[PDB]
Ligand binder design. Structure first.
Ligand SMILES: Cn1c(=O)c2[nH]c(Cl)nc2n(C)c1=O
Length: 285
């Protein structure tokens, strides 16, 4: 199809509402929980949306857990996003990351090993790799091991990556080249290759067609939800938005639009219509 993905958790706009609030919009389909910012030693950060912890200090988030389940009843997909700009994360090798697949499965997925579960009995629909530290070690091996474990589950799981538009990406390039990935939420902002810059969708399309181990990987046009969601690359021209979408929706590789982040895209108005709503509507046509 064509979906809207939104990051949620880091409260970019200040006025961030509950996960479920955004799920109860018609406006977004995929929700990326931002972030598991610390690993292999587990650490979550959802700005103001979760502050309770287990005794060991790992976040414990009952409201998000309830909201994951509400979101899923409404047909939405909820992935846990790893990493972030800033944060505290690194794999020393493939074996370490393979161990970590099991940790994720037992902590967030349908794994049976009795670890502390930040989301109680709520189960994510998969993981986003928003690696922004320019270290690529382990992610490919982690994704591949996760896939083997997913077969033990009772639903489809998704893996995504959040590269910036320069190709190849210095953090998730290896992941994208050597693992089976469902969605690429490519950040077309803070970079020369934005829509208004030297837009390089064509390179990503070559990647999807010839390089991606998953040939029906879906590429997403990743955008700021407001001017001031990022330093640069935000698009307020609905004609440019229209022509862009028309250019890129031609192929089976086009998945939709990704936005940083829900707080921003839902509160940013273009004459009283939320930005996320404008974009959802541009996609449907
Ligand atoms: C802090 N930060 C992120 O962690 C992030 N991930 C993605 Cl995909 N976009 C962004 N932006 C724009 C950020 O500012």
């Amino acid at each position: 199809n064509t979906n809207i993905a939104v990051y949620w958790g880091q409260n970019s706009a200040g006025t961030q509402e509950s996960l479920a609030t955004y799920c109860e919009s018609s406006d977004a389909d995929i929700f990326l929980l931002s972030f598991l910012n610390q690993f292999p030693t587990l650490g979550l950060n959802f700005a103001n949306a979760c502050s309770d912890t287990f005794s060991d200090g790992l976040l414990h988030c009952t409201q998000i857990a309830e909201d994951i389940e509400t979101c899923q009843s409404l047909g939405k997909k909820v992935l846990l996003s790893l990493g972030g700009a800033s944060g505290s994360y690194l794999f020393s090798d493939d074996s370490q990351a393979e161990t970590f697949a099991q940790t994720l499965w037992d902590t967030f997925g349908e794994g049976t090993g009795a670890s502390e579960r930040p989301f109680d009995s709520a189960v994510v629909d998969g993981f986003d790799f928003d690696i922004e530290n320019n270290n690529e070690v382990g992610y490919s091996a982690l994704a591949t091991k996760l896939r083997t474990l997913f077969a033990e589950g009772t639903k489809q799981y998704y893996l995504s990556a959040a590269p910036q538009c320069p190709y190849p990406d210095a953090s998730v390039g290896d992941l994208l080249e050597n693992a089976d990935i469902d969605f690429a939420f490519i950040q077309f902002y803070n970079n020369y290759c934005s829509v208004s810059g030297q837009f390089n969708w064509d390179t990503w399309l070559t990647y999807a067609q010839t390089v991606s181990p998953n040939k029906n990987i879906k590429l997403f046009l990743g955008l700021p939800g407001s001017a001031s969601a990022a330093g640069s690359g935000y698009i307020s021209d609905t004609s440019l938005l229209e022509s862009t979408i028309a250019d890129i929706a031609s192929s089976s590789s086009f998945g939709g639009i990704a936005l940083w982040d829900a707080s921003q895209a839902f509160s940013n108005e273009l004459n009283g219509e939320p930005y996320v709503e404008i974009l959802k509507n541009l996609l449907t046509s």
